[PDB]
């Protein structure tokens, strides 16, 4: 009845309380160096704190047993906003410092972050069921479904930026490749020799992201890196200098043709990583093969 407007105040504070707790969860965790929880809990503590709190909140709102589902609906409608903003602010804090964490001097972090942003998406949808899922209020859920979409975008953005972190490096190696390659005038060893420059990436790195990323994280990052590798090759060896800011200006194509299969294997990672159906149908690959054909 008129209990409703009292409670809605609690809800207004809860947002504020929650919103303050997140800062201290993150801040506690940032200082600690964003350790993944275990070897299998691939997310760090900041993400345990924020949800146990948000779930406490909900627990108590439920314990606030209430008959009128037009009152209940309204509580959830207000709560939803809380979740959206906390997560959205977890989203944003993380995205900020992200580029700054991307030194392969302390390289675990970026992954644990992207990891956490996904662990967000997880526990959310998991909270989406605590509140009634389908039966849940219309306005409430609507703004929750909108939250997922926005988290997704964030994940997509960190993966892009994370991969991008590697771009100057890859550009140098792909150089060292075009050089070595040139020197050729066996085909299956020329491949190995040419690829030595970029092999560190393909091997240790993808191996690392293998171990530490989450399925959804590894995908998005790999997809990214594959694009970097593919394009940098295209521009650095294949395209005429009139068509590349990377060219500071044969039979060798074969080499790059088996190279590609090799690389492709490193991005497939025994099916841990990216799939062949995908790689076989990647425009950046398809575009590489074009360039290779024309030249």
Which technique was used to obtain these atomic coordinates?
Answer: X-ray
**Long-range residue pairs from 137-140, CB within 8 A, at least 24 positions apart, any chain:** 137/72, 137/73, 137/74, 137/76, 137/77, 139/77, 139/80, 140/73, 140/76, 140/77, 140/79, 140/80
| Residues 191, 89: Cα–Cα separation, whole Å | 47
Q: Is residue 53 packed enough to be buried (19+ CB in 10 Å), middle (13-18) or exposed (0-12)?
A: middle
Question: Domain 166-295 belongs to what topology?
Answer: Methane Monooxygenase Hydroxylase; Chain G, domain 1 (1.20.58)
Helix 46-63 and helix 108-130: axis angle, to 10°? 10
> Strand, helix or coil at 67?
coil
Q: Where are the domains of the chain?
A: 1-165, 166-295
| Residues 59, 41: Cα–Cα separation, whole Å | 24
> Strand, helix or coil at 261?
helix
Question: Domain 1-165 belongs to what topology?
Answer: Tetracycline Repressor; domain 2 (1.10.357)
| Residues 290, 54: Cα–Cα separation, whole Å | 52
Are the CB atoms for 51 and 123 separated by under 8 Å?
yes
Please tell me what resolution, in angstroms, this structure has.
2.7
In total, the chain counts a number of residues equal to 295
Q: To which H or E segment does residue 260 belong?
A: helix 253-268
């Amino acid at each position: 009845a008129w209990f409703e407007p009292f409670v809605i105040q609690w809800l207004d504070e809860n947002e504020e309380v929650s919103r303050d707790f997140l800062h201290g969860a993150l801040e506690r965790d940032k200082k600690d160096g964003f350790q993944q929880t275990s070897e299998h809990a691939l997310f760090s503590c900041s993400v345990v704190d924020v949800f146990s709190q948000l779930n406490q909140s909900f627990e108590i709102i439920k314990k606030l047993e209430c008959p009128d589902p037009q009152i209940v609906g309204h509580y959830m409608r207000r709560f939803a906003k809380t979740i959206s903003n906390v997560l959205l602010q977890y989203a944003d804090i993380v995205s900020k410092d992200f580029a700054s964490y991307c030194s392969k001097e302390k390289e675990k972090v970026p992954c644990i972050l992207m990891n956490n942003t996904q662990q967000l998406r997880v526990q959310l949808e998991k909270m989406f069921e605590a509140m009634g899922g389908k039966e849940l209020d219309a306005e409430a859920s609507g703004t929750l479904k909108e939250l997922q979409v926005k988290l997704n975008n964030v994940l997509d953005e960190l993966s892009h930026v994370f991969a991008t972190s590697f771009q100057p490096h890859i550009e140098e190696c792909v150089r060292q490749m075009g050089d070595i390659l040139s020197q050729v005038k066996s085909v299956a060893q020329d491949a190995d020799n040419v690829l030595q420059p970029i092999m560190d990436l393909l091997d240790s790195n993808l191996t690392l992201f293998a171990k530490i990323c989450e399925k959804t994280v590894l995908k998005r990052v790999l997809k990214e890196l594959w694009k970097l590798v593919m394009n940098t090759m295209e521009r650095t060896i294949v395209l005429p200098p009139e068509f590349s800011k990377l060219k500071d200006h044969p039979k060798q194509c074969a080499v790059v043709e088996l190279a590609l299969d090799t690389i492709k294997q490193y991005f497939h990672a025994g099916g841990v990583g990216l799939k062949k159906t995908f790689l076989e149908k990647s425009p950046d690959l398809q575009s590489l093969r074009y360039a290779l054909s024309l030249y």
